[PDB]
Amino acid sequence: SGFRKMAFPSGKVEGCMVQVTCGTTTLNGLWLDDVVYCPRHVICTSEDMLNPNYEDLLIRKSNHNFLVQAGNVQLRVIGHSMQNCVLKLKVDTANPKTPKYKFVRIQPGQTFSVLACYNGSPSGVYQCAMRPNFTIKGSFLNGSCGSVGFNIDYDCVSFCYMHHMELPTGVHAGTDLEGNFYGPFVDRQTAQPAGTDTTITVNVLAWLYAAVINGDRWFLNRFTTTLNDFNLVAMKYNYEPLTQDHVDILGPLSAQTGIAVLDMCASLKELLQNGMNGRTILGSALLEDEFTPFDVVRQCSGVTFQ
Amino acid sequence: SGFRKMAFPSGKVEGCMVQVTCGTTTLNGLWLDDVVYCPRHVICTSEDMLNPNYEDLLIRKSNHNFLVQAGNVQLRVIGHSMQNCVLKLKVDTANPKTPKYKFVRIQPGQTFSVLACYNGSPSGVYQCAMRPNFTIKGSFLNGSCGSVGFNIDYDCVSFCYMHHMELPTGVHAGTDLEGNFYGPFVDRQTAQPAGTDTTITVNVLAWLYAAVINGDRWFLNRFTTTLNDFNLVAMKYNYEPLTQDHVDILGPLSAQTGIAVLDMCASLKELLQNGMNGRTILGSALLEDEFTPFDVVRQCSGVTFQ
Numbered sequence: 001s002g003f004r005k006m007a008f009p010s011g012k013v014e015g016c017m018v019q020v021t022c023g024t025t026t027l028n029g030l031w032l033d034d035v036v037y038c039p040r041h042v043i044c045t046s047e048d049m050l051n052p053n054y055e056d057l058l059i060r061k062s063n064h065n066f067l068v069q070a071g072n073v074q075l076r077v078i079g080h081s082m083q084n085c086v087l088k089l090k091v092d093t094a095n096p097k098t099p100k101y102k103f104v105r106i107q108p109g110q111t112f113s114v115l116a117c118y119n120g121s122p123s124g125v126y127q128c129a130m131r132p133n134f135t136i137k138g139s140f141l142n143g144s145c146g147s148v149g150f151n152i153d154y155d156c157v158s159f160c161y162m163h164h165m166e167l168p169t170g171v172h173a174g175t176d177l178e179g180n181f182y183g184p185f186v187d188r189q190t191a192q193p194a195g196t197d198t199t200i201t202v203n204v205l206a207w208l209y210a211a212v213i214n215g216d217r218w219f220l221n222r223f224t225t226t227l228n229d230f231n232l233v234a235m236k237y238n239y240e241p242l243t244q245d246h247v248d249i250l251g252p253l254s255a256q257t258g259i260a261v262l263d264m265c266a267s268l269k270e271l272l273q274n275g276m277n278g279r280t281i282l283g284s285a286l287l288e289d290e291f292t293p294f295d296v297v298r299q300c301s302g303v304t305f306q
Numbered sequence: 307s308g309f310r311k312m313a314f315p316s317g318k319v320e321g322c323m324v325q326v327t328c329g330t331t332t333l334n335g336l337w338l339d340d341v342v343y344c345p346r347h348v349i350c351t352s353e354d355m356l357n358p359n360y361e362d363l364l365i366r367k368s369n370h371n372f373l374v375q376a377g378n379v380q381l382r383v384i385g386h387s388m389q390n391c392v393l394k395l396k397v398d399t400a401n402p403k404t405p406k407y408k409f410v411r412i413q414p415g416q417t418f419s420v421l422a423c424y425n426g427s428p429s430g431v432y433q434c435a436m437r438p439n440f441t442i443k444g445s446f447l448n449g450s451c452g453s454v455g456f457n458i459d460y461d462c463v464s465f466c467y468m469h470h471m472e473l474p475t476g477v478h479a480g481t482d483l484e485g486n487f488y489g490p491f492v493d494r495q496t497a498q499p500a501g502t503d504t505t506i507t508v509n510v511l512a513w514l515y516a517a518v519i520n521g522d523r524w525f526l527n528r529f530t531t532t533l534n535d536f537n538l539v540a541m542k543y544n545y546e547p548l549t550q551d552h553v554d555i556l557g558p559l560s561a562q563t564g565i566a567v568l569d570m571c572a573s574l575k576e577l578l579q580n581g582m583n584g585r586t587i588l589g590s591a592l593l594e595d596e597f598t599p600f601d602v603v604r605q606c607s608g609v610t611f612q
């Protein structure tokens with residue numbers, strides 16, 4: 001029993017982190033086989049970053065201008081190219097620690113683990129969700145760019161995020177591993193608008209199932225509701241609509257606990273309308289929306305990775 | 307910016323996990339050089355665990371009765387001994403992935419990362435604190451025993467916890483790596499009393515400093531207090547006494563923010579007496595006590611590990 005915010009084991013990703021330096025700018029890169037992936041603004045000076053022309057800046061670089069260090073071993077760069085907002089540096093050595101891997105683009109509401117790194121070295125690991133406004137609530141300092149987000153499936157690391165930038169409100173933005181930003185953002189140091197965020201309903205429901213599995217059952221009421229009626233009530237509270245796809249994904253938790261999804265929705269509706277009346281669920285005084293249904297199953301059923 | 311519950315990178319520990327089976331009981335072991343460390347109740351049947359005589363049970367085992375698997379490679383056992391509540395299995399192969407390491411016994415209030423494992427394979431990583439009553443609030447299922455807790459210092463893994471047991475309230479107990487329990491517990495399936503828990507004051511103060519560093523400053527009041535006056539008020543709220551040692555450990559955060567420790571204590575006193583009036587600090591509606599002063603510094607200053 002017990003329920004914690006849990007990250008994936010980070011070792012497979014640790015074996016892929018390197019330091020990339022161009023001029024006096026240093027950040028992290030991801031070394032897979034004979035390619036290093038990193039944010040393209042490694043080629044910028046501080047002044048360039050206010051309004052960069054990355055294509056022009058890259059024209060004036062050659063391979064040897066990129067200092068790639070894996071520990072205290074320099075990796076010789078033998079080619080380079082830009083793909084959207086990421087640079088790809090071909091090196092003459094394949095990473096022997098390369099795991100089985102995929103590049104994926106995740107959906108708003110899905111979670112991932114972040115291995116926060118500085119100078120090519122890991123600092124720590126934490127769990128994040130892609131918010132509905134395509135930001136993440138991370139923890140990142142100067143030099144963290146190129147840190148990656150990922151999920152694991154048995155032996156396969158699915159990389160989904162590379163870190164690029166922070167909005168002065170402490171929220172974070174980045175790209176998939178093809179260099180395409182999540183959200184309407186660009187890698188330039190200028191003010192940019194983000195959509196208002198919303199609560200990830202299907203995840204709140206998953207966490208209420210986690211609560212029941214752990215014996216925290218006080219909020220279960222005797223009612224049911226329709227999907228339509230639930231979505232009208234939840235819209236007022238800035239919850240995202242719950243779809244039939246979401247109901248279907250909640251099926252395994254519903255079957256395990258014997259609580260119908262629409263019955264759990266009726267309990268959530270009461271919590272939204274009435275509050276929690278000074279009580280906690282799984283130790284929290286607020287409803288938590290950064291556990292997916294799979295997160296709950298993998299933690300409560302002890303799924304392992306190879 | 308941003309502040310998350312952050313675990314240490316787990317890769318160095320992942321390389322040490324193995325599966326140990328004796329009879330039909332299987333749990334996790336920790337393989338360092340040519341020794342595997344695991345909970346001694348691997349030698350128990352389910353019935354033995356109600357009232358085990360471990361010395362008698364071990365008498366009747368020989369080396370070959372222990373099946374140790376590192377991946378799909380069986381490690382030949384060539385000696386065994388019991389040290390308090392842990393078994394030590396000598397194997398004929400040294401773990402080539404053994405990190406620099408130490409065995410330490412941590413103090414109540416200190417935190418560590420847990421790599422939760424099943425069948426010798428990692429499931430996930432999360433951060434825990436040793437509670438003042440010597441329990442931890444973990445997330446552990448059947449088969450998790452032998453999972454370890456640890457801290458890292460540059461390249462050195464300090465192992466501080468091995469998991470043994472769950473009290474039916476969802477809290478957890480275990481040993482240091484010399485097999486000595488934290489707290490007044492024994493590895494037998496019978497009801498046992500734990501002390502009432504208390505709030506780790508020095509950690510709450512560390513987290514309030516983390517909040518200020520992140521721009522969450524609403525709770526700062528204009529007052530100071532004495533250490534004596536703070537401790538009288540906090541005792542009522544089941545907070546542990548704040549010592550001069552604690553004040554000294556908070557020095558780096560105090561100097562960084564320019565807020566005297568006793569001034570932060572005056573702000574905490576107001577929060578304890580008045581509540582948070584529907585507001586949050588770092589997104590939490592409750593005061594958080596499972597970040598140490600070092601946790602705050604290592605996250606907010608980007609300390610890395612080798």
Ligand SMILES: *C(=N)[C@H](C[C@@H]1CCNC1=O)NC(=O)[C@@H]1[C@@H]2[C@H](CN1C(=O)[C@@H](NC(=O)C(F)(F)F)C(C)(C)C)C2(C)C
Pocket residue numbers: 027041044049140141142143144145146163164165166167168172186187188189190191192307
């Ligand atoms: C990569 N190493 C850093 C990570 C930042 C630094 C502080 N916390 C983080 O997550 N990325 C940057 O410094 C990027 C980079 C130029 C400026 N930048 C920012 O993150 C800035 N934010 C923005 O410009 C905004 F608001 F639009 F997101 C900064 C004000 C420095 C936090 C480029 C090329 C975008």
Ligand SMILES: *C(=N)[C@H](C[C@@H]1CCNC1=O)NC(=O)[C@@H]1[C@@H]2[C@H](CN1C(=O)[C@@H](NC(=O)C(F)(F)F)C(C)(C)C)C2(C)C
Pocket residue numbers: 001333347350355446447448449450451452469470471472473474478492493494495496497498
């Ligand atoms: C190790 N693999 C498990 C981990 C447990 C299992 C469920 N969650 C956990 O953390 N350890 C055990 O099963 C130990 C073991 C016998 C019984 N046990 C318990 O954890 C039991 N708890 C107690 O006996 C109590 F309450 F005293 F802590 C159980 C009721 C099965 C949760 C031995 C040898 C103590």
